[PDB]
Design a protein around this ligand. Structure first.
Ligand SMILES: CCCCCCCC(=O)O
Length: 133
């Protein structure tokens, strides 16, 4: 049910990521660097537990979770959030909540590419990842 998302993915396109980061309050110097970074995202499962790694020259993150079970997360920009990841319409939907705020990170597969849509406030960012062999 998560199976086609699994593997190693490389960023190959990004739209409106600065808008998204700015909406979250990320400072200008961090946004510079992030705008030029091409992370690698690794999605692995072991039974019911998924692990999602994001690696770059700037920041690294790792989360582990079961689908449909809330978990604590500390994001790349140091927000302490309550998170849940589910499958919805075949999309992997990650919802983060903190301070009454929310942001969604939605992943879907289109033509074999992994499209990540990030929404916070009115900002909508679309990042495209391609699978590494
Ligand atoms: C720093 C803002 C929060 C995380 C951004 C995730 C981007 C990505 O995985 O391509």
């Amino acid at each position: 049910m998560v199976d086609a998302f699994l593997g190693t993915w490389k960023l190959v396109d990004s739209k409106n990521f600065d808008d998204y980061m700015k909406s979250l309050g990320v400072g200008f110097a961090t946004r510079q660097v992030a705008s030029m970074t091409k992370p690698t995202t690794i999605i692995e499962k072991n039974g019911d537990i998924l692990t999602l790694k994001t690696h770059s020259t700037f920041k690294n993150t790792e989360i582990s979770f079961k689908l449909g079970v809330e978990f604590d997360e500390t994001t790349a920009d140091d927000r302490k959030v309550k998170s849940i990841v589910t499958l919805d319409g075949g999309k992997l939907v990650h919802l983060q909540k903190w301070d009454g705020q929310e942001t969604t990170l939605v992943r879907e597969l289109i033509d074999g590419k992994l499209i990540l849509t990030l929404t916070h406030g009115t900002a909508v960012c679309t990042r495209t990842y391609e699978k590494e062999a």
